[PDB]
A paper describes a structure:
The multi-lipidated [name] subunits insert laterally into the hPIEZO1 pore module like mPIEZO1, resulting in a more curved and extended state. To solve the structural basis of [name] on hPIEZO1, we co-expressed it with hMDFIC in HEK293F and purified the complex. We obtained a 3.0 Å resolution cryo-EM density map of the hPIEZO1-[name] complex. The overall cryo-EM density map is similar to hPIEZO1 alone with a disk of about 30 nm, but allowed us to validate the [name] density with multi-lipidated cysteines on the C-terminal amphipathic helix. This C-terminal helix inserted laterally into the pore module where the exact position of mPIEZO1 is found. Interestingly, while [name] does not significantly alter the curvature of mPIEZO1, it induces a more curved and contracted architecture in hPIEZO1 from the side and top views, respectively. Combining with the similar effect of [name] on mPIEZO1 and hPIEZO1, we suspect that [name] decelerates hPIEZO1 inactivation and weakens its mechanosensitivity by remodeling the pore module and exerting more blade curvature. We were surprised to find an apparent lipid density in wild-type hPIEZO1-[name], hPIEZO1-A1988V-[name], and even more evident in the 2.8 Å resolution map of hPIEZO1-E756del-[name] in the pore module, where one of its hydrophobic fatty acid tails inserts into the hydrophobic pore formed by I2447, V2450, and F2454, thus sealing the pore to prevent ion flow. In addition, another fatty acid chain of the pore lipid interacts with the acyl chains of the covalently linked [name] lipids, forming a stable hPIEZO1-multi-lipidated [name]-pore lipid complex. Therefore, we deduce that the hPIEZO1-[name]/hPIEZO1-A1988V-[name]/hPIEZO1-E756del-[name] reshape the pore module and fall into a deep resting state, in which it becomes rather tricky to remove the pore lipid from the hydrophobic pore by mild mechanical force.
PIEZO channels transmit mechanical force signals to cells, allowing them to make critical decisions during development and in pathophysiological conditions. Here, we report several near-atomic resolution cryo-EM structures of fast-inactivating wild-type human [name] (hPIEZO1) and its slow-inactivating channelopathy mutants with or without its auxiliary subunit [name]. Each hPIEZO1 subunit has a curved blade structure, and the three subunits form the trimeric PIEZO channel, exhibiting a bowl-like shape. [name], a MyoD family inhibitor protein, has recently been identified as an auxiliary subunit of piezo channels capable of decelerating channel inactivation and attenuating channel mechanosensitivity.
Numbering used by the authors:
A (entry chain E), I (entry chain F): 227 to 247
B (entry chain A): 1698 to 1747, 1779 to 1803
C (entry chain B): 2426 to 2521
D (entry chain A): 1941 to 1980, 1999 to 2050, 2060 to 2231
E (entry chain B): 2135 to 2279
F (entry chain A): 1408 to 1427
G (entry chain A): 1165 to 1213
H (entry chain A): 2474 to 2521
Write the structure that this text describes.
């Protein structure tokens, strides 16, 4: 049950894994 | 029209649209629109005098160019 | 007529895929300069490095005369200069 | 005379000022994309068109950074004629029709730049204007494009009037890029704050972690799978079409060539 | 630790050389960056980047494109295997009888089958001195067995 | 000179003197 | 707008039937498209010759 | 990072107005911020 | 018109792009 809030969270945090924060 | 037909057909008006109409003091002119109508009519006439089995995308061209003329006549 | 294969692998995808891979890796190689150039402006933008070369050359001089006790001592200075960025600023001041 | 008047009123004039470079470049990016995709004499043609899109984009950047309306006029005139003459060199198509269409949009937005003018404030990355989440993602994507970041830097340096060298220009660009990314993240954390001490949301963890694991699986296992799959396919029936039994007997003249073929 | 002192020294030397040259030849305060210098370095970098992407493609295409070596049947071996038991009728010919069709000859064949598009296409696409003439011998002498 | 003026930064620049 | 749908037919009658009469139809359209808005309000009853 | 982006954007502003003397001066600030980690801590403080 | 002064400048600055200063 991936919510849109979760979906942005996931995306942003993978971006933080590569890019800063 | 230049995407449906090629060579002497088009490649005169599209060039002029990019180099005269869109590169002008505000509204193109009157001579641009006149030459557009004239060229489209000439093209129609010579394609009718035969290129064979001529296409008429110049119908919708001439009529749109005369619609704009009416819009700018009313101002 | 006959067609001589001047490809080797596969012009359609083998060589093509290799080319793409090369481009990407060369991409990363070139990024390797213009990505973290700012993480060194503390070890590369020193105004006057004269005092640090003296230290370095003193280590060399003390190894030729084989007084290796002072080698350890002068190495300690070198590593503390490079362990505290603020002391590098002090030591690399243009005039004094 | 009339031509001179047209050009005078396209240069001196009394018009406004807009920055449509972003959109012009986007049109050219789409053009590049469809020409790259349109590899389908043809490879040579597509390779020349590649070099072309590229060279024209570089020239455009020059004129934008040097704010040259006269230069843009010249470029536009030349490019219009040349692209229209390239329609005659069709000898190496939906791809080409679309390339023409998107180049027409570029010519329209370029014509607009010339007839409007160049605005005073031209510097500043398009995707660093606002500090949201979309700007963040777009900027990071631009940085992920193989050589766009570095090309932008070097190019801009060459045109923009600076006192600094390339090394130092690249320093300020790196600092700015990193600072922007941090700012976007800070802004989003102020917009949507996360309670103090609130786990990390099971789902978020499962997603990112899962993706990473799967990517690692595809580094080791997937190649092996693909390799084995392709190599395993072996075995095409090969049957002797004919049975040629030449019972070479006579040492001097070997004979006994009674033999058969496929029917038998 | 030996490598540490070597790295430090190397970097320090490079910095010193640059500092010394800036003292020897000072650059006025706020003096652009010299258009030519910029054009040179920038240009080289751009060209190097061009040669990362475009040049390989060019080289690749150039080599691969070269294709096409004329292959003409040296002989026309028509063995009209007739008898089921003993296939014979091997009257056939070789290069002397085989005629590599000339340019004019090719035009003739192409025009003969010009009405049919694909027929002409076959002939025309095949390069001149490609289409060979099957002048198979029909005379016997070889009795059969 | 460019060199000396780009290597002139000190701590006094970063003091909080009404930085608006 | 009927004055004008007729102008469309005038054009297309020429186009379809490729002849000399067709060229004349084409011309009749070209003309009454140019000099046409004038006589759409001046030929309403005033001499529709 | 607000105070650092101001510095960065001031360098950009000073290059558009072509007052390149101040470009050199503002670059000096940028490099000293990144040459002393302690001043970065001071300049990047959350509130003041 | 690349002068010798420009030529050394160019060379040194490409060296600075790779090596320090
Ligand atoms: C909008 C669409 C975005 C995709 C465009 C086309 C995709 C092209 C390739 C994109 C792949 C994305 C992977 C990014 C991985 C992050 C690493 C990175 O440096 O990403 C860099 C950009 O570098 C690139 O050019 C991206 C390609 C990296 C190569 C990885 C691809 C794997 C395939 C090759 C495998 C071998 C890996 C390399 C071998 C040895 C290399 C020395 C971004 O940090 P940054 O410093 O500017 O950060 C600023 C502050 N840290
Ligand atoms: C929000 C997209 C899912 C997380 C990103 C994974 C990479 C793409 C896989 C599926 C694309 C929708
Ligand atoms: C379809 C599986 C991944 C293919 C490429 C998607 C890239 C993932 C992006 C991760 C966060 C946006
Ligand atoms: C081919 C397009 C897919 C994008 C390539 C990978 C992008 C995500 C990988 C790592 C995230 C920064
Ligand atoms: C991953 C950095 C944000 C950029 C957004 C798109 C980049 C490619 C990821 C997914 C492509 C299929
Ligand atoms: C960082 C790992 C996230 C998933 C991989 C992103 C897409 C890159 C393409 C590699 C194939 C899985
Ligand atoms: C840093 C870019 C300058 C030009 C490249 C230097 C020579 C390296 C060989 C690569 C072929 C262009
Ligand atoms: C001073 C040499 C020109 C700049 C260096 C470029 C790489 C060599 C190309 C021509 C060698 C003379
Ligand atoms: C002939 C083009 C480059 C080949 C190798 C030259 C190396 C360039 C050096 C850049 C500054 C010295
Ligand atoms: C084969 C000899 C040419 C030298 C190789 C490249 C040297 C210059 C490239 C980058 C400059 C540091």
């Amino acid at each position: 049950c991936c919510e849109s809030s979760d979906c942005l969270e996931i995306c942003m945090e993978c971006c933080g894994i590569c890019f800063p924060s | 029209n230049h995407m449906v037909t090629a060579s002497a057909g088009s490649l005169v008006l599209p060039v002029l649209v990019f180099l005269w109409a869109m590169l002008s003091i505000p509204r193109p002119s009157k001579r641009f629109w006149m030459t557009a109508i004239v060229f489209t009519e000439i093209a129609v006439v010579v394609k009718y005098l035969f290129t064979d089995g001529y296409i008429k995308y110049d119908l919708v061209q001439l009529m749109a160019l005369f619609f704009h003329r009416s819009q700018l006549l009313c101002y | 007529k006959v067609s001589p294969p001047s490809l080797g692998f596969l012009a359609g995808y083998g060589i093509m895929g290799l080319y793409v891979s090369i481009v990407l890796v060369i991409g990363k190689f070139v990024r390797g300069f213009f990505s973290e150039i700012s993480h060194s402006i503390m070890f590369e933008e020193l105004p006057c490095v004269d005092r640090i070369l003296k230290l370095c050359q003193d280590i060399f001089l003390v190894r030729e005369t084989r007084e290796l006790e002072l080698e350890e001592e002068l190495y300690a200075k070198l590593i503390f200069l490079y362990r505290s960025p603020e002391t590098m600023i002090k030591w690399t001041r243009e005039k004094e | 005379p009339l031509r001179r008047f047209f050009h005078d009123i396209l240069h001196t004039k009394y018009r406004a000022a807009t920055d449509v470079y972003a959109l012009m470049f986007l049109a050219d990016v789409v053009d590049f994309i469809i020409i790259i995709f349109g590899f389908w004499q043809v490879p040579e043609a597509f390779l020349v068109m590649l070099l072309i899109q590229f060279s024209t984009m570089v020239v455009d950047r020059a004129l934008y950074l040097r704010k040259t309306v006269l230069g843009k006029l010249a470029f536009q005139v030349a490019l219009v004629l040349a692209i229209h003459l390239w329609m005659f060199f069709i000898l190496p198509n939906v791809v080409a029709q679309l390339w023409y269409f998107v180049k027409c949009i570029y010519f329209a937005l370029s014509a607009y730049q010339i007839r409007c003018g160049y605005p005073t404030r031209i510097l500043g990355n398009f995707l660093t204007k606002k500090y949201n989440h979309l700007n963040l993602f777009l900027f990071q994507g631009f940085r992920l494009v193989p050589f766009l970041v570095e090309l932008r830097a070097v190019m801009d340096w060459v045109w923009t009037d600076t006192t600094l060298s390339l090394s130092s220009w690249m320093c300020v660009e790196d600092i700015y890029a990193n600072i922007f990314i941090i700012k976007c993240s800070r802004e989003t954390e102020k917009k949507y704050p996360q309670p103090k001490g609130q786990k990390k949301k099971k789902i978020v963890k499962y997603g990112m972690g899962g993706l990473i694991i799967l990517f690692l699986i595809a580094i080791i296992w997937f190649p092996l799978l693909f390799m084995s799959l392709v190599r395993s396919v072996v075995g095409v029936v090969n049957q002797p079409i004919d049975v040629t039994v030449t019972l070479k007997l006579g040492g001097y003249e070997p004979l006994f060539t009674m033999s058969a073929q496929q029917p038998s | 630790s030996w490598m540490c002192v070597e790295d430090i020294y190397a970097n320090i030397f490079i910095i010193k050389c640059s500092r010394e040259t800036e003292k020897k030849y000072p650059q006025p305060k706020g003096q652009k960056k010299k258009k030519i210098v910029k054009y040179g370095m920038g240009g080289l970098i751009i060209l190097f980047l061009i040669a990362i992407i475009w040049f390989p493609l060019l080289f690749m295409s150039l080599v691969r494109s070269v294709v096409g070596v004329v292959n003409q049947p040296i002989d026309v071996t028509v063995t009209l295997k007739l008898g089921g038991y003993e296939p014979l009728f091997t009257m056939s010919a070789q290069q002397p009888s085989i005629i590599p069709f000339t340019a004019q000859a090719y035009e003739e064949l192409s025009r003969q089958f010009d009405p049919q598009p694909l027929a002409m296409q076959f002939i025309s696409q095949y390069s001149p001195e490609d289409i060979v003439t099957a002048q198979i011998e029909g005379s016997s002498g070889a009795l059969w067995r | 000179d460019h060199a000396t003026v780009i290597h002139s930064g000190d701590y006094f620049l970063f003091e909080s003197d009404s930085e608006e | 707008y009927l004055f004008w749908l007729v102008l469309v037919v005038v054009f297309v009658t020429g186009a379809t039937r490729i002849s000399i009469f067709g060229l004349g139809y084409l011309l009749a359209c070209f003309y009454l498209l140019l000099f046409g808005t004038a006589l759409l309000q001046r030929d309403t009853r005033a001499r529709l010759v």
